[PDB]
Amino acid sequence: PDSWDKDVYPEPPRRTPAPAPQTSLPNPVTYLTKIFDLLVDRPVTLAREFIEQQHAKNRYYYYHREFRRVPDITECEEKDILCMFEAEMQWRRDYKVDQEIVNIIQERLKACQQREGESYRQNCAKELEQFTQVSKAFQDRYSDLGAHYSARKCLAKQKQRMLAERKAAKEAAA
Amino acid sequence: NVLQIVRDHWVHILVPVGFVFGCYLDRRSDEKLTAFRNKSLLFKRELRPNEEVTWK
Amino acid sequence: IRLQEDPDPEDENLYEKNPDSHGYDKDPIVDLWNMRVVFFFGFSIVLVLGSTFVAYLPDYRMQEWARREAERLVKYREANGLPLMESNCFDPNKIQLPE
Amino acid sequence: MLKIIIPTTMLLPMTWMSKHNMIWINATVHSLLISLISLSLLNQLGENSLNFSLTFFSDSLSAPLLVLTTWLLPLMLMASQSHLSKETTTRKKLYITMLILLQLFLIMTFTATELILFYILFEATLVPTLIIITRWGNQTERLNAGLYFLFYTLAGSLPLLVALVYIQNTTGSLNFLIIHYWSHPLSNSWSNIFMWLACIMAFMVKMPLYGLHLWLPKAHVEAPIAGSMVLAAVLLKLGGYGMMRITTILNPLTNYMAYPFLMLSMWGMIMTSSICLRQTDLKSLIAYSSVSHMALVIVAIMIQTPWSFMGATALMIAHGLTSSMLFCLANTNYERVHSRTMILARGLQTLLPLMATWWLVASLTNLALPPSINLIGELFIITASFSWSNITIILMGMNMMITALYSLYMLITTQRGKYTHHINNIKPSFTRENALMALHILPLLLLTLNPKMILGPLY
Amino acid sequence: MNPFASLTLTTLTILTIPIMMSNSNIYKTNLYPNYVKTTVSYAFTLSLVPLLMFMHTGQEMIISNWHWMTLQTVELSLSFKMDYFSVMFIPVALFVTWSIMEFSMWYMHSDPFINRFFKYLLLFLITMMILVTANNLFQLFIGWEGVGIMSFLLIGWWHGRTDANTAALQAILYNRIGDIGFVLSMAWFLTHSNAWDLQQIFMLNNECPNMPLIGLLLAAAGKSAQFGLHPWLPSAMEGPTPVSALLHSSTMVVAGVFLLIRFYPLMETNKLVQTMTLCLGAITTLFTALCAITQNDIKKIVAFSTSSQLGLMMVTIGINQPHLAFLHICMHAFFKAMLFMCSGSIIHSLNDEQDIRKMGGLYKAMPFTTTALIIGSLALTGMPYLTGFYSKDLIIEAVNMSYTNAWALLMTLIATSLTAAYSTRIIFFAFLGKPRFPPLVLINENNPLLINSIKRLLIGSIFAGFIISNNIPPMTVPNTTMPLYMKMTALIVTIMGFMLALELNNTTYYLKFKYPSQTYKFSNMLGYYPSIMHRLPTYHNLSMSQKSASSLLDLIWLETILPKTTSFIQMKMSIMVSNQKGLIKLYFLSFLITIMISMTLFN
Ligand SMILES: CCCCCCCCCCCCCCCCCC(=O)OC[C@H](COP(=O)([O-])OCC(O)COP(=O)([O-])OC[C@@H](COC(=O)CCCCCCCCCCCCCCCCC)OC(=O)CCCCCCCCCCCCCCCCC)OC(=O)CCCCCCCCCCCCCCCCC
Ligand SMILES: CCCCCCCC/C=C/CCCCCCCC(=O)OC[C@H](COP(=O)(O)OCCN)OC(=O)CCCCCCC/C=C/CCCCCCCC
C-alpha cells in the first residue's frame, strides 16, 4: 500500500503456493471463504466506496512542519541563556527523532520474526544486526543521562567518551 | 417576579466575568513579552504582505 | 450534672418527610434542582465534553511529526549506506578536548 | 493562568452573596465549570513547558495536578453538604470559603515558577487545612491532630526557606527555568550535604516519609470528610511535586544521599502494609495505605530515572483518586452508624447493593489491578527499581501481596458476612452519595483509557 | 483481507457484547441466561471457522490493531496473536463454557441472582480469552489478573459463608505470589530486551537466563496450583458447582501451563529451569494423587484429580514437549468438565449431599450420569482409544524415553497408578452397592438441559481426541521404537492401580474395624500442609503486624523519639524559665552577674 514507504518498511515478496487438491471431497474452507466474501466483503467495500466518494468532495490538506537547524550547545557560550535555550530545544527534538528511529527498527525486527516463523533464527539475522548497531549507538548517546537530562549533560558525556578513546589510542600506540 | 429573579440570581455571572477578565489579563501579560517576536533563529521569517506581527 | 447542656439530638432522616429525596437538601425543590444541576453539569458537560476534548486535543507533543522525521532520516541514511544512528550527538571538530 | 485564578477569587464573593439555601448549588455548579475550563491545560508541548508570564507557568507535571484539584473541589462540596445540614448560614459560608482558599492556594502553588513563591504558597496551604480540621472535626483528638500536622510541616519546611534564600544569594535566581539551564554539579562536602538535607527533608516530611508520618494518621482520622479528601488527594502530592522540581540542582549528590531514604521508604512501605493488616479503624487503614503508596513514590523519585518519574506521576494521580473514593465510602458508612469501628457494621452488601459495588471497584483500584493507572504507575516504578537493583523486586512483591491482602480484608469485613442484628438505621443510599462515587470512579477509568496525559514531562 | 483476523476478533467482540446488554430489561428478566448461552454457541461456531482455516494451511497471524502508548523506545499496543495455540484453545473453551452454561441454567434455577451468575461467567470467559490471545506481557498480565479476580468473585458466591470468604482470600493470596513472579519476569524482560512482546523477546533472548525463566516458573506454579502453592485449588470448591466445573478445573488452572508453553523457546534454551519444572510437576502430581485417593468429598476428589493432571502437564513441559502439554490441556478440559458436571448432577439430586459415604445405588438410580461418569473415568485413566489416550499415553512414553530425573519418572508412574485408584474409589463409593441417602428419594435426572449438556460433553470425551490428534501437523519426533514393556507401561500401572484399589475397597464390607494408620491420617489430612502452613506463618505475620509495627514502633517509639521527647524538653525548660518568685533582689543579683560576665568574657 501507498500509505507508507516500502523502503522504510520493507516486506519480502510474498510467495503463496498454488492449491493442488488430491481428493474429491469439497473444501469447507473454500466454501466458507466464498460465503464470507459474499456476505461481508461486498457490503464493507460498498460502504467504503460511498465514504471515500464523500471524502473526495471536501478534499483538504495538512503539511509537515519543518524546523531549520540552529547553533548547538558546543557553539553556545557559557551562560548565554538564549543560545542555550535554542540548542536545548534542538537537542530535545533530535532525541525524539532518534527514539522514533529505534521504534522503526524494532517494528522491523518484530515483523521479520513473525513473518519467518519457524526459521527466524537464521532469516532474521540481517535485521538483528541493524537493531544491534542502532541500539549500541542510542545507548552510547543517551544511556545514563538521568531524569534531568540536557544537552550539556550529553555533551559532557561525549567529552568523557572522547577523552577515554584518546587515552586508549595513546596507550595502544605507546 | 422578574426583579426577584435578578435579585437572587445575579451572583451567577461573577465567575463568567472573572473568566473573561482573566482571559483579558492573560492577553495583556502576553503583549508585554514581545521582545523576541519574529526574531528567534528557529522561527524567523519574512512578514506576509498583509500582516504586521507574527503573533499577538 | 455539671452543666446546663442540651441533650444529644436524634438523627434526622430525609426520607421521612420526602420519600423521593435525593439527599441534597431538606427542601424538596432545592434538593431536586441540586440533583439536576450536579448530574447535568458534572456528568454530561465535564465527563463527556472534556473526554472528547482531550481525545481530540491537537498533537502538540509532536509524536507524528517525530515519526515522519524518523522515517525520512531512516530512508535517507539507509539509501546512502550511512549508519542509521550516528554514534555522536555533537561534532568532534566543534568539540575541543583539553591537552 | 489568570483565566483560572480569577474565577476562584470570584467564587468567593458569589458564595458570600448567595442565598442561604443556594450556596451549595452555586458553589457546585461554578466549581464544575472551573474544572471544565482548567481541562484545557492538558494540551502540553513535548519540548518545553507553557510559559504564560514571568510568574506562572504550566508543565506536563503541573497540568494533571491542577485538573485533579479543580475536579476535587466539587466532590468536597458534596460531602461537606452531606455532613453540615444543621450548621448556620455564616458557618457554612466560612467552610466553603476555607475550601475555596485551599483550592486557590493549591492552584497557585502548582503554577508558581519560582521556588520562593512556591514555598510561600505551599506553606500558606497550612492555615485553611488547620482551621478546617480543628474547627469542624468531630472528636476530641482534632486539636492534637492539628498541632501535630502544623508542627511537623513547619519543622520540616523552615530549613527549606533558609536553604532557598541561601541558594538565591549564591546563584542569583530561584527561577526554575534559570536553575535548570544554569545548573552546576553539587560537590561532596558537608555544606552541600546539609543543603541537600534541608530541601529533601522538608519535602519528605510533606510526603510523608516513614518515621515522619504520625501526623498523617492523626490528621486524616480526625479531620472532617472534606479535609480528609483534600489532605490525601492533593496535599500529599505537594511533596512529590517539590522533590521532582528541586532535584535538578541536587546532582550528583543525590546518588550518595538517597540510600537512607530509599531504605526507609521500602521498609516502611512493608511495615505500613502490615499495620493495615491489623487495623481496628477504617480511616486509619486508608491512611496507612496512603502512606505506603507515597513511600513507593518516594522510592521512584529517589532512584530518579525517566521511567521512574512517569510512574511516580501516574501513581500520584491514581492514589489521589482512589484515596478520595475510599474516604468517601468510609464517611458514608460512618454517617450510617456514627462509629468508625470496622466490625461494628456488617452485611452491607445485602443491605446496600450499589454501595457494595462501589466498594468492590474502589478496592480493586486500590490494589494494582490492570490496566488501571494505579498498576501502570506501580509497574513503572517496579521496573525502574529493578534496573536499580534486583532485591527491590522482592520488596515490591511483598508489598503488592500485603496490599491485596489488606484491601480484600477491608472489603470482606465491611461488606460480606451477616448483617449486625441491632443496627436498624441503615437507610437506602442517597442519589448524592451514588453520584459522588460515580464522579470519583469514572475519571480514573477514562485516564486508564488515555494514559499519556498523566505520565509527566518524561513521556 | 484474509477472513482469519476478522473472524477471530469477531468472536472476541461477540463474547463481549452481552456484557453491554447487562443494563437492560433483558438483564432484568429471566431470558438473560438463555441469551448468554446462545451468544456463547454462536461464538463457538464462529471460532470453529478459523480452526478449519488453520488446519488446512497452518495460517498464523498477529494483529496489532490499537496503539496504546509509547514509553520512549517501548511501544505498548493492543496486539492479538492468533496462532495454533489460540485457534485450538478458543473453540474448546467456548464449547466447554456453552455446556457449563446450560448445566447452570438447570442447576442454578432457584438462585435469585442467576443473571448475575451468568454475567460473571461471561466476564471470566472474556478475561480467559484475553489471556490466551494476548501477544504482549502487559496484555497477558491483564488477562492473568482478570481471571484471578473473577475467580475471587465466583468462589465467594455466597457472601454469608465464612468458609467461602476464606477460600476466596486464600486463592487471591496464592495468585498474588504468582503475580510477584510474573512482575519479576516482566521487569527483567523489559530491562534486558527493551520489549514486552514475544517477537522481540524471542529475537533478542537467544539464551534466556535463570532470573526471567524462574520468574515465569513461579507465576505458572502459582496459577496452576503446583506443590507449595497447591492448597487454594482444593479449597476453591466452596463456590457453586458450575464455577468449579468451568473456571478452575477446565480453563483457569491451565493458565500457568499455557504461560510456560508460550515461552517454550526460552525454556528449551535453559536446562536448570527445565529440571526444576520437571521436579515440581512430578512432586505435585504425586502429592495430589496421594491426597486424592482417600477423600470423602466428591468435589475435593475431582479437584485433586485436576491438580494431578496439572502436575502431569508440568512434567510434560519439563521434558521439552510443549505441544503434548497443550494436547493434554484440551483433552483434560473435555473430560474433567464432564466429570464435574456429573458430580454436580449427583449432588443436586441428593439435596446438596456431597459425601460418597451417603451416596450409593446411583448405578441404577441414575443411568445417564452413571454412564457419563464411567466414560469420563475411563478417559481420565487412559483407556486405549478414548480422548485421554492421545495425550497421557504419549506423555508417559516421552517421559520413559527421555534423559530425565529417575525419581521424577518413578513419581509420574506412581501418580498414574493413584489416578486409576481414585477414579475407582469414586465409582465404587458413588454407584455400587446399596443406598445410603435419606429415605425420601428425590432422584430425578430427566431434565433436557442437563441431559443435552452432558451429551455434548460426552461425545467430545470419545471422539474429540482422535480428530484433534489426526488433524494437527506433526510438531515433534515420534517415539517409534521402544521396548514392549515400556510401550505398555501406562496400561500396566493403570491396571495395577485398578486392581489394588478395588481390592482395598472390597475389604470394607467385612465386619472388621481397625484404627487408622499414620499413613492414612497423613494422606487424608492433605499431608498436614494446610494446617501448619495456614496457622504458623499467618499467626506470626499477624502477631508481628500488631506487636511490632503498630504498637512497638508506630504508637510507642516513633512517638517517643521525635515528637514526645521534644515536647517534654520544651515543657521542662518552660517550667525552669517561668519558675520565678518575682524578687527584685534575686534578679538584680542576676543582672550584676550578667554585667560581670559581659565585661570579662567579651573583648
Ligand atoms: C517419609 C516418607 C516419604 C515417602 C515419599 C514417597 C511416597 C510414595 C507413595 C506410594 C503410594 C502409596 C499408596 C498408599 C498410601 C495411602 C494408603 C491409604 O490411606 O489407603 C487407604 C485408602 C482407603 O481409604 P478408606 O476407604 O477411607 O479406607 C480406610 C482405610 O482402610 C484405613 O486402613 P489403613 O489406615 O490400615 O490403610 C493404610 C494401610 C493399608 O493400605 C495399604 O495396604 C495400601 C497398599 C497400596 C499398595 C502398596 C504395594 C504395591 C505393590 C505393587 C507390586 C507390583 C510392583 C510392580 C512390578 C510388578 C512385576 C514384578 O497402609 C499402610 O499401612 C501402609 C501402606 C504403604 C505405605 C507406603 C508409604 C510409606 C510411608 C513411610 C512408611 C510408613 C510405615 C508405617 C505405617 C504407619 C504406621 C502404622 O486406600 C485407597 O483408597 C487405595 C490406596 C491405593 C491402592 C493402589 C495404589 C497403587 C499405586 C501405589 C503402589 C505402586 C504401584 C506401581 C507404581 C509404578 C511402579 C513403576
Ligand atoms: C515472596 C514473599 C512472600 C512469600 C510467602 C510469605 C507468606 C506470608 C504469609 C501471609 C500472611 C497472612 C496474613 C493474613 C492472611 C489472611 C488471613 C488468614 O490467615 O486466613 C487463613 C486462610 C484460611 O485458612 P484455611 O486453611 O482455609 O482453614 C479454614 C478453616 N475454617 O488460609 C490462608 O490463606 C493462609 C495461606 C498463607 C500461605 C503461607 C505459606 C505460602 C507458601 C510459601 C512457600 C511456598 C513457595 C512456593 C514454591 C514454588 C516453587 C516454584
- CB < 8 Å to A89, chain B: 42
Contacts of A170 (CB under 8 A, 6+ apart): none
Instruction: Assess contact for E85 and E8: CB atoms under 8 A.
Output: no
Lookup: cell for B55: 503573533
How do the residues of chain B divide into helix, strand and coil, expressed in percent and rounded to 5?
50, 0, 50
Question: Which residues in D lie closer than 8 A to residue A92 (C-beta atoms)?
Answer: 46-48
| Inter-helix orientation angle E489-506/E406-431, to 10° | 40
Length of chain B as a residue count: 56
Q: Which helix (H) or strand (E) holds E68?
A: strand E61-71
| Nearest atom of ligand 2 to the alpha carbon of E235 | 27
* Distance set, CA D149 to CA D133, D134, D153, E11 (Å): 10, 11, 6, 56
Helix (H) or strand (E) holding E329, with range, is helix E322-349
Contact E454, E372 (CB under 8 A): yes
Give the C-alpha distances (Å, rounded to integers) separating D204 from C43, D152, D173, D236, D314.
37, 11, 24, 10, 19
> What is the three-state SS of E70-123?
EECCEEEEEEEEECHHHHHHHHHHHHHHHHHHHHHHHHCCCCCCHHHHHHHHHH
Q: Is E299 exposed, middle or buried (0-12, 13-18, 19+ CB in 10 A)?
A: buried
Alpha-carbon distance of E83 to E58, in angstroms, equals 9
Q: Are D25 and C30 in contact (CB under 8 A)?
A: yes
User: In whole angstroms, what is the distance from residue A148 CA to residue E247 CA?
Assistant: 48
E588 to each of A46, D312, E578, E585, how far by Cα in Å?
A: 108, 62, 17, 5
Dihedral class, residue E582 (left if φ above 0, else alpha if ψ from -120 to 50, else beta): left
Measured in residues, chain A has a length of 174
One-letter identity of residue D9: T
**d(CA C8, nearest CA chain D) in Å:** 13
Q: Which amino acid is at A58?
A: N
The C-alpha cell 513472579 sits at E181
Nearest to E79 by CA among E130, E115, E113, E124: E130
Is the distance from CB of D257 to CB of D196 less than 8 angstroms? yes
Phi then psi for residue E156, to 5 deg, are: -90, 50
Q: Are E457 and E338 in contact (CB under 8 A)?
A: yes
How many contiguous H segments (helices) and E segments (strands) does chain C have?
4, 0
Distance, CA of E476 to CA of E321 (rounded, Å) = 8
Burial profile D260-269: b = 16 or more Cβ within 10 angstroms, e = fewer: ebbebbbebb
Pocket test for ligand 1, best of E291, E507, E519 (most atoms within 8 A of CB): E519
Q: Cα separation of E90 and E108, whole Å?
A: 26
DSSP E67: E
- Report the C-alpha gap between E563 and E549 in whole angstroms: 18
DSSP SS3 for D114: strand
Contact yes or no, E with B (3+ CB pairs under 8 Å): no
Report which of D214, D267, D43 is spatially closest to residue C58, judged by C-alpha positions: D43
Residue with cell 433436557: E448
Chains in contact with D, counting 3 or more C-beta pairs less than 8 Å apart as contact: A, B, C, E
How far does the centroid of ligand 1 lie from the alpha carbon of residue C29, in Å? 79
User: Which H or E run includes A155?
Assistant: helix A151-173
Q: Characterize E130-162 residue by residue with b for buried, 16 or more Cβ atoms within 10 angstroms of its Cβ, and e for exposed.
A: bbbbbbbbbbbbbbbbbbbbbbbbbbbbebebe
Helices (H), C1-99: 14-17, 28-37, 51-55, 63-79
The amino acid at A105:
I
> How many distinct helices (H) and strands (E) make up chain A?
6, 0
Q: Are D65 and D234 in contact (CB under 8 A)?
A: yes
Q: Which residues are within 8 A (CB) of E562 and not within 5 positions of it... i.e. 6 or more apart?
A: D211, D212
- CA dist D328 → C39, D349, D430 (Å): 18, 17, 13
Q: Are E179 and D382 in contact, with CB atoms under 8 Å apart?
A: no
Nearest to E342 by CA among E420, E418, E286, E423: E423
In angstroms and rounded to an integer, the radius of gyration of the C-alpha atoms of chain D is 21
- Atom 40 in ligand 2: which residue has the minimum CA distance? E533
Closest CA to D386 of E263, A145, E176, E183: E183
Per DSSP, the three-state class of E229 is coil
Q: How far is CA C83 from CA A123, A131, C88, in A?
A: 21, 11, 12
Q: Are D37 and D69 in contact (CB under 8 A)?
A: no
Q: Mapping DSSP to helix (H, G, I), strand (E, B) and coil, where does residue C92 land? A: coil
How would you class E531 by CB atoms within 10 Å of its CB: exposed for 0-12, middle for 13-18, buried for 19 or more? exposed
Helices (H) and strands (E) in chain B, counts: 2, 0
Q: Output DSSP code: residue E22.
A: G
* D383 φ/ψ sector (left φ>0, alpha ψ -120 to 50, else beta): alpha
Question: Mutate which of E305, E503, E520, E528 to test ligand 1's pocket (most atoms within 8 Å of Cβ)?
Answer: E520
Burial of residue A27 (number of CB atoms within 10 Å: 0-12, 13-18, 19+): middle
Q: What is the 3-state secondary structure (H, E, C) of E23-59?
A: HCHHHHCCCHHHHHHHHHHHHHHHHHHHHHHHHHHCC
Cβ neighbours for D435, distance < 8 A, ≥ 6 positions apart: C35, C38, C39, C42, C43, D78
Q: Determine the Cα–Cα distance for residues E53 and A27; give it in Å rounded to an integer.
A: 10
Q: Across the interface, do E159 and D307 touch by the CB < 8 Å criterion?
A: no
Amino acid (one-letter) located at D303: I
Helix (H) or strand (E) holding E62: strand E61-71
Please report, for residues A15, A140, C11, the alpha-carbon distance to residue D85 in angstroms, rounded to integers and kept in the order given: 77, 65, 11
Eight-class DSSP state of E199: H
The DSSP call for residue A144 is: S
The torsion region of residue D411 among left (phi > 0), alpha (psi -120 to 50) and beta comes to alpha
Interface C:D, Cβ pairs < 8 A = 94
Q: How far apart are CA E65 and CA E72, in angstroms?
A: 20
Q: If you measure from the C-alpha of residue E229 to the centroid of ligand 2, how many angstroms do you get, rounded to a whole number?
A: 9
Task: Return the SS3 of E342.
Answer: helix
C-alpha cell at D137: 472535626
Q: Please tell me what DSSP assigns to residue E356.
A: T
**What are the boundaries of each domain within chain B?**
1-56
- The CB density around residue D333, as the number of other CB atoms within 10 Å, is 22
What lies within 8 Å, CB to CB, of D47 at 6+ separation is A89, A92, A93, C62
Query: At CA D252, angle to CA D248 and CA D253, rounded to 5?
Result: 100
Instruction: Tell me how far apart the alpha carbons of residues E77 and E67 are, in angstroms, rounded to a whole number.
Output: 4
All residues of chain D having their beta carbon less than 8 Å from the beta carbon of residue C22 are 430-432
What is the position in ligand 1's atom list of the atom closest to the CA of E522?
19
CB-based contact E52 A114, cutoff 8 Å: no
Q: E168 CB less than 6 Å from ligand 2?
A: no
Distances in whole angstroms, Cα of residue B32 to Cα of each of D55, D211, E114: 13, 48, 68
Helix (H, G, I), strand (E, B) or coil at E297: strand
The type of residue at A137 is A
Interacting residues of E472 by C-beta distance below 8 A, sequence separation 6+: E55, E84, E88, E323, E327
DSSP-derived secondary structure letter, E355: B
Q: Which of E106, E155, E96, E103 is nearest to E128 (CA)?
A: E96
E47 and E11 Cβ atoms separated by less than 8 Å: yes
Contact yes or no for E302/E343 (Cβ under 8 A):
yes
CA-based torsion, E349, E353, E358, E359: positive or negative: positive
Q: Distance of CA E46 to CAs A32, A80, D300, E71, Å?
A: 11, 67, 47, 36
Q: What is the DSSP letter of E401?
A: T
Residue E54: phi and psi, rounded to 5, are -75, -45
Residues with Cβ within 8 Å of D6's Cβ and at least 6 positions away in sequence, in order, are: B18, B19, B21, B22, B25
Q: Which of D51, D165, D73 is nearest to D119 (CA)?
A: D165
Is E542 within 8 Å of D277 (Cβ atoms)?
Answer: yes
Q: Which amino acid does the sequence have at E115? A: N
Q: What are phi and psi of E197, to 5 degrees?
A: -115, 150
3 state SS of A153: helix
For the record, the C-alpha cell of D286 comes out as 486508608
C-alpha closest to that of D47 among A97, C34, A9: A97
Q: Specify the DSSP class assigned to residue D419.
A: P
> Closest ligand to D393 CA?
2
Looking at ligand 1, which atom is closest to the CA of residue E523?
Answer: 19
Instruction: Find where cell 493495615 sits.
Output: D276
Question: CA–CA separation, E182 vs E216, rounded Å?
Answer: 6
Spell out where D2-66 has E strands: 50-51, 57-58
Q: What amino acid occupies position D388?
A: W
DSSP state of D42: G
Quick check: do A and C touch, 3+ CB pairs under 8 A?
A: yes
d(CA A18, CA E452): 43
| Cα–Cα distance, E535 to E540 (Å, whole number) | 9
Q: Which three cell numbers stand for residue E259?
A: 504461560
C91 Cβ partners below 8 Å, 6+ apart?
A: A74
Query: Where does residue D73 fall: left (phi above 0), alpha (psi -120 to 50 degrees), or beta otherwise?
Result: alpha
* Helix (H) / strand (E) containing D159: helix D142-171
Question: Which amino acid would we find at residue E208?
Answer: C
- Strands (E) across A8-152 are located at none
Q: Which of E356, E247, E307 is nearest to E526 (CA)?
A: E307
Q: Which residues of A touch D304 (CB under 8 A)?
A: 146-147
Q: What single letter denotes the amino acid at residue E453? A: S
Q: What is the largest CA-CA distance in chain D?
A: 70
Helix, strand, coil percentages, rounded to 5, for chain D: 75, 0, 25
State the helix-helix crossing angle for D431-449 and D353-366, rounded to 10 degrees: 30
| Ligand 1 binding site (Cβ under 6 Å of any ligand atom) | E 290, 293-294, 413-414, 417-418, 421, 425, 493, 496-497, 500-501, 504, 516-520, 523
At position E210, the amino acid (one-letter code) is N
Distance CA B9, CA D53 (A): 35
Residue D70 CA to residue D33 CA, distance in Å, equals 9
Residue A121 burial (CB < 10 Å; 0-12/13-18/19+)?
middle
What DSSP string runs through E438-484? -SS-------HHHHHHHHHHHHIIIIIHHHHHHHSPP-S-------H
CB contact under 8 Å between B18 and D7, yes or no, is: yes
C-alpha cell at A3: 500509505
A171 in C contact zone (CB under 8 Å): no
C-alpha cell at E138: 502487559
CA distances from D319 to D205, D237, D338, E252 (A): 18, 10, 27, 31
CA distance E360 to E464: 31
Strands E61-71 and E74-82: antiparallel
E390: which 3 cell numbers?
Answer: 492421545
Q: Provide the residue type at D420 as one letter.
A: T
Burial environment of residue E59 by CB neighbours within 10 A (0 to 12, 13 to 18, 19 or more): middle
- In angstroms, the CA D94 to CA D80 distance is 12
Sign, CA dihedral B33-B39-B41-B46, equals positive
CA D394 to ligand 2: nearest atom: 1
If 0-12 CB within 10 Å is exposed, 13-18 middle and 19+ buried, where does residue D216 land? buried
C34-37: long-range contacts, CB 8 A cutoff, minimum separation 24: C34/D24, C34/D25, C34/D28, C35/D431, C35/D432, C35/D435, C37/D25, C37/D28, C37/D29
- CA-nearest residue to D442 within chain C is C47
CA distances from E333 to E302, E304, E328, E550 (A): 13, 14, 8, 47
For chain E, helix (H) and strand (E) counts, in that order, are 29, 2
Using CA atoms in the order E432, E434, E436, E439, what is the torsion angle rounded to 10 degrees? 130
Interface probe for D, chosen from B4, B9, B12, B19 (most Cβ of D below 10 Å), is B19
CB atoms within 10 A of CB D401: 19
Say which residues have a Cβ less than 8 Å from residue E237's Cβ, sequence separation at least 6.
Answer: E167, E244, E297, E299, E300, E303
